[PDB]
Amino acid sequence: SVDCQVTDLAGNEYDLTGLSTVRKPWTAVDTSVDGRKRTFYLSVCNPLPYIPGCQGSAVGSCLVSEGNSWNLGVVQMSPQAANGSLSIMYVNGDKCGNQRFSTRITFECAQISGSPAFQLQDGCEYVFIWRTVEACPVV
Numbered sequence: 001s002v003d004c005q006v007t008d009l010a011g012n013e014y015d016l017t018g019l020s021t022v023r024k025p026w027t028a029v030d031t032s033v034d035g036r037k038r039t040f041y042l043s044v045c046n047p048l049p050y051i052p053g054c055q056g057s058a059v060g061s062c063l064v065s066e067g068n069s070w071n072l073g074v075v076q077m078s079p080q081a082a083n084g085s086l087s088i089m090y091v092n093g094d095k096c097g098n099q100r101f102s103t104r105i106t107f108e109c110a111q112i113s114g115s116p117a118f119q120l121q122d123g124c125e126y127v128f129i130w131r132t133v134e135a136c137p138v139v
């Protein structure tokens with residue numbers, strides 16, 4: 001139940017409803033070495049559809065690896081424009097040390113239909129880069 005439409009301070013409209021997951025989630029491109037046995041599942045604004053092991057929390061980001069599943073953050077905030085670059089933040093996932101896992105997707109306006117890619121693990125935060133045409137200002 002999160003709005004996928006945001007207007008930045010400068011007045012640029014962003015519309016991410018085209019990335020919303022109605023039936024199946026997004027699958028993250030991961031060419032890391034730690035990505036051999038791990039799959040990241042992602043959704044924009046909407047919670048993930050049923051994925052075994054991360055049900056119950058309106059999970060927006062699920063790591064599935066070797067049978068086990070981890071909740072990497074729930075959908076609460078809308079995509080944040082805050083200079084013109086888009087970001088969405090899922091936090092308060094499964095326990096990660098003294099904190100909880102979180103997921104950040106950084107969007108970049110690119111004239112292509114892109115898929116989110118795993119970029120970085122910053123402690124308990126999983127960082128994703130999404131270069132795609134939907135990250136561009138709407139009319």
Ligand SMILES: [Cl-]
Nearest residue numbers: 021022023024
């Ligand atoms: Cl779909």
Ligand code: NA
Nearest residue numbers: 052053054055
């Ligand atoms: Na289950």
